Chains A and B, each alone.
Chain A
């Protein structure tokens, strides 16, 4: 670095130099031992800079995992007595930093002067700003579902259709597709009630303040109906609404779980508690789950196994690994074993070097379930980082190993690994998209679906088109879901296949000669393609430059809907709104419009079925692909403190 340090100051300035060094270092450096050395040296030149840059001082700090350093840097922006650059950099920190990291900064600031920091770190205003953003512009088509209602039967499509509309209102809280018609809702029962009630949670996600009383409709003393599943789903509902945010719910959920009735509601509590307190590693919750998990009932193992991982996510705790793997060597029940497939895998997250001991122990295990559970470990142990060793082992298992489920999971794990380089990602699945084994094909379709979901890659869709007509019924389901993710919020901007795909969905839902499971992916795909009224998107990466923990964990769980349909609700976590928001000095959101520099057709909504200055107010959405084609009117009294090239909350500066 000494020759690097000397090059920090040179005959040339730092316009792009030292700006492309960071971009290059992140995308090429493999070993972390050297990555940290080069990074913190990259924080040095900013600190000594005459007008130090602060937008990216924290962004480059989060990787190093230095909770204290950010605290002092933030305070030096209060003693200096400017709330502008010390305010904006606080919102980006919340969006892209780990909760343990974020929780590790408040206590420095904490230990109404104390209100300004604490509030801006939880993001509650952002959620409210997000919630206000969603409700402000919601364009969902009643006919789009209406054309699906006529195809609804007494089959699983009913519970598939309830899942579909929930995605179209992820946070909008417009529960009127489910309120205009109810007698149809009472058609499916004895497991849909848990799934349907879950669909309520996703719709109301972010409505934290008015949360408990909205679940109050399902209290024992209020109605007390003949089914306990509907009340159980309320515990599940809290998790979906309160995703990645546990306040008083942790006390509430613990209170409900402490008293245990028949374990048909204890499934929701374990999942609901896990969603409420994901990635926190609180010993209090961990202990309670064990006593529930050790009850050794199949209907409760899946909730316990998955939940146990969620709470202790990214912990590499020795006791948790011993207990989780220990229980998955003597439980005769299989459903609990299934839940531990992701529970142990989740616990080891973003490690890439500490999973070697467990990966060798799991991938070599005799039990078929544990073999795949190890595959997910490598899937998350090396998330994003396109490690060659991980793919090498993964590819060998995906071709030579015996059990089909382990092979299916092996190919799906590829997407998590090569997602940082979407273009190349289809290079490893081209030959595997037509393998002899239908199961390998399904993973291939989902390998692209979760790998390059954000981008509408041309080659990716060309691969999925031929596989959309495969004779294998379930392989067809995987094909459709891949397309829905890949062309999310795409309107003729990526390729002209967006128009055709929607009509392809209809023909497969309107036909009476298609496999009941085959149309399940189609109906669910239609909802995914229009997630949250087109105002949400799925992207495992954040605009700042950090991988989105909730999205990766959620999407991995969503792919696990072969074994538990109601478990297929963990896709709201991966939903991230695509919007740019301007704010006042402290809290006000002004009323300004920023125009675009492209044709209006590209930005246009699908609309129910030549200007170059597209107008959009402050609470306006711009897709990340076209987020760079916007115009900020300099003639306005407000100016953007952040560059208007990477979206999200922006503290607009008045002039």
Chain B
């Protein structure tokens, strides 16, 4: 009787912990517990996540330790705020985002204690710059398939927005477990304290970058255009011939002065414009 609009909100901070722990044990399958709060009959939100110590050698999520669970949970409450374990996350190095046989088996354990537990898989290698790749999942009852009645009782065009990955579909996707849409919560205090902080400098603006070395860099770059320009002449006559596709493929083994010359010019103009501009700006700021 799920609502196929779960929309598990994760965090602006729980994600960073998930990724950092995932990459730390990249060869293995680290596991942890999600500390979130159920809110609606339609949404489950996580707030914080804490890792569980690795049992040792072996790429598996075999079991959780009850005593460690209690000790940290009973310790976070007395300083932070109480939270209830809502799901567990384990990082798949590069396989993808799905649940294996062991992962399914460990999952029903959590569901037994809590009906709406959510399992999450984080991939720390596939995610590169703007894609994190999580795809939180949950199990489907075997009785339903035996009954044959389709689960999730779709009542909105919200869950069928992400095309399931073919790699995930090969495994028990929509057969032994169903994915739940995952979105994120972001606020200006979080964003402004991260975006306007990551790549910044204090006083590098008014620094003249080793004026002696600056012109030496210019001489080396310009001298490269002397030979580069000469090859440009030899690269214009032989062009504009038949089968330009033949010409296009003919530039797959030898440097093309058309692009190389422009690249050097681009760096040359910006380096001096900035370097020169700082000269006059400084001459007025300081005496």
Across the interface, do B149 and A566 meet the contact criterion of CB distance under 8 Å?
A: no
**Quick check: is A333 within 8 A (CB to CB) of the other chain?**
yes
Across the interface, do B163 and A298 meet the contact criterion of CB distance under 8 Å?
A: no
**Quick check: is A474 within 8 A (CB to CB) of the other chain?**
yes
Contacts of B188 in A (CB 8 A): 366
* A155 closest partner in B (C-beta): B150
Across the interface, do B153 and A190 meet the contact criterion of CB distance under 8 Å?
A: yes
Across the interface, do B157 and A561 meet the contact criterion of CB distance under 8 Å?
A: yes
Known: A299-B41, A333-B39. A366 touches B187 (CB 8 A): yes
CB-contacts of A554-570 with B (<8 A): 561-566
Per a CB cutoff under 8 Å, which of A191, A516, A517 touches B155? A191
Across the interface, do A566 and B155 meet the contact criterion of CB distance under 8 Å?
A: yes
Shortest Cβ gap from A565 to chain B (Å): 5
- The total of interchain contacts (Cβ-Cβ below 8 angstroms) comes to 54
Across the interface, do A517 and B158 meet the contact criterion of CB distance under 8 Å?
A: no
Contacts of A551 in B (CB 8 A): none
**Quick check: is A335 within 8 A (CB to CB) of the other chain?**
yes
Across the interface, do A154 and B161 meet the contact criterion of CB distance under 8 Å?
A: no
* A516 closest partner in B (C-beta): B160
**Cα(A440)–Cα(B188), bound, Å:** 26
Per a CB cutoff under 8 Å, which of B7, B155, B157, B163 touches A334? B7
**Cα(A155)–Cα(B39), bound, Å:** 28
Shortest Cβ gap from B162 to chain A (Å): 10
Across the interface, do A156 and B154 meet the contact criterion of CB distance under 8 Å?
A: yes
Per a CB cutoff under 8 Å, which of A154, A517, A561 touches B160? A517
Across the interface, do A563 and B153 meet the contact criterion of CB distance under 8 Å?
A: no
Across the interface, do B40 and A334 meet the contact criterion of CB distance under 8 Å?
A: yes
Shortest Cβ gap from B166 to chain A (Å): 14
Across the interface, do B155 and A562 meet the contact criterion of CB distance under 8 Å?
A: no
**Quick check: is B1 within 8 A (CB to CB) of the other chain?**
yes
* A191 closest partner in B (C-beta): B155
Across the interface, do A298 and B160 meet the contact criterion of CB distance under 8 Å?
A: no
**Quick check: is A236 within 8 A (CB to CB) of the other chain?**
no
Shortest Cβ gap from A524 to chain B (Å): 11
Across the interface, do B42 and A335 meet the contact criterion of CB distance under 8 Å?
A: yes
Across the interface, do A154 and B150 meet the contact criterion of CB distance under 8 Å?
A: yes
26 residue pairs A–B, Cβ–Cβ below 8 Å = A154-B149, A154-B150, A155-B154, A156-B154, A190-B1, A190-B153, A298-B41, A298-B42, A298-B43, A333-B40, A333-B43, A334-B7, A335-B42, A366-B187, A474-B157, A477-B157, A517-B160, A520-B157, A561-B156, A561-B157, A562-B156, A563-B5, A563-B156, A565-B154, A565-B155, A565-B157
Per a CB cutoff under 8 Å, which of B1, B156, B160 touches A473? B160
**Cα(A563)–Cα(B157), bound, Å:** 6
Contacts of A154 in B (CB 8 A): 148-150
| Chain B residue total in the interface (Cβ 8 A) | 22
**Cα(A517)–Cα(B148), bound, Å:** 20
Shortest Cβ gap from B230 to chain A (Å): 42
The 10 closest A-B pairs by CB, nearest first: A298-B40, A517-B160, A562-B157, A191-B155, A156-B154, A154-B150, A333-B40, A565-B155, A563-B156, A332-B39
Contacts of A517 in B (CB 8 A): 157, 160
Contact bitstring B131-160, A, C-beta under 8 A = 1, else 0: 000000000000000001110011111101
Interface residues of B (CB under 8 A from A): 1, 5, 7, 39-43, 148-150, 153-158, 160-161, 163, 187-188
Contacts of A335 in B (CB 8 A): 40, 42
**Quick check: is A53 within 8 A (CB to CB) of the other chain?**
no
Shortest Cβ gap from B200 to chain A (Å): 22
**Cα(A293)–Cα(B101), bound, Å:** 45
**Quick check: is A515 within 8 A (CB to CB) of the other chain?**
yes
* A194 closest partner in B (C-beta): B155
Contacts of B153 in A (CB 8 A): 190-191
Across the interface, do B42 and A474 meet the contact criterion of CB distance under 8 Å?
A: no
Shortest Cβ gap from B87 to chain A (Å): 19
* A153 closest partner in B (C-beta): B150
* A156 closest partner in B (C-beta): B154
Shortest Cβ gap from A208 to chain B (Å): 30
Contact bitstring A184-215, B, C-beta under 8 A = 1, else 0: 00000011000000000000000000000000
**Cα(A298)–Cα(B156), bound, Å:** 14
Contacts of B158 in A (CB 8 A): 562-563
**Cα(A526)–Cα(B39), bound, Å:** 39
Contacts of A191 in B (CB 8 A): 153, 155
**Cα(A156)–Cα(B5), bound, Å:** 14
**Cα(A204)–Cα(B283), bound, Å:** 84
Across the interface, do A564 and B160 meet the contact criterion of CB distance under 8 Å?
A: no
**Cα(A155)–Cα(B152), bound, Å:** 10
CB-contacts of A141-174 with B (<8 A): 154-156
Shortest Cβ gap from B133 to chain A (Å): 18
Contacts of A366 in B (CB 8 A): 187-188
**Cα(A191)–Cα(B158), bound, Å:** 16
Contacts of B1 in A (CB 8 A): 190
**Cα(A226)–Cα(B152), bound, Å:** 20
Contacts of A563 in B (CB 8 A): 5, 156, 158
Contacts of A298 in B (CB 8 A): 40-43
CB-contacts of A322-338 with B (<8 A): 332-335
Instruction: A155-B154, A334-B7 given; name 4 further pairs at CB < 8 Å.
Output: A474-B160, A515-B160, A562-B157, A563-B158
Contacts of B41 in A (CB 8 A): 298-299
Contacts of B163 in A (CB 8 A): 473
CB-contacts of A261-300 with B (<8 A): 298-299
* B7 closest partner in A (C-beta): A334
**Cα(A566)–Cα(B156), bound, Å:** 9
Across the interface, do B42 and A334 meet the contact criterion of CB distance under 8 Å?
A: yes
Shortest Cβ gap from A155 to chain B (Å): 6
Across the interface, do B39 and A565 meet the contact criterion of CB distance under 8 Å?
A: no
Shortest Cβ gap from B8 to chain A (Å): 12
**Cα(A155)–Cα(B153), bound, Å:** 8
**Cα(A566)–Cα(B154), bound, Å:** 11
Contacts of B154 in A (CB 8 A): 155-156, 565
* B42 closest partner in A (C-beta): A298
Shortest Cβ gap from B41 to chain A (Å): 6
**Cα(A335)–Cα(B154), bound, Å:** 15
Residue of B5, B40, B43, B188 with highest tally of chain A CB at under 10 A: B40
* A402 closest partner in B (C-beta): B186
* A562 closest partner in B (C-beta): B157
Shortest Cβ gap from B3 to chain A (Å): 9
Per a CB cutoff under 8 Å, which of A334, A520, A565 touches B43? A334
Shortest Cβ gap from A445 to chain B (Å): 14
Residue of B39, B41, B157 with highest tally of chain A CB at under 10 A: B157
**Cα(A400)–Cα(B156), bound, Å:** 27
* B45 closest partner in A (C-beta): A332
**Cα(A334)–Cα(B149), bound, Å:** 29
**Cα(A133)–Cα(B111), bound, Å:** 58
Shortest Cβ gap from A159 to chain B (Å): 8
* B1 closest partner in A (C-beta): A190
**Cα(A335)–Cα(B7), bound, Å:** 11
**Cα(A547)–Cα(B1), bound, Å:** 42
Across the interface, do B156 and A565 meet the contact criterion of CB distance under 8 Å?
A: yes
**Cα(A515)–Cα(B157), bound, Å:** 12
Contacts of B187 in A (CB 8 A): 366
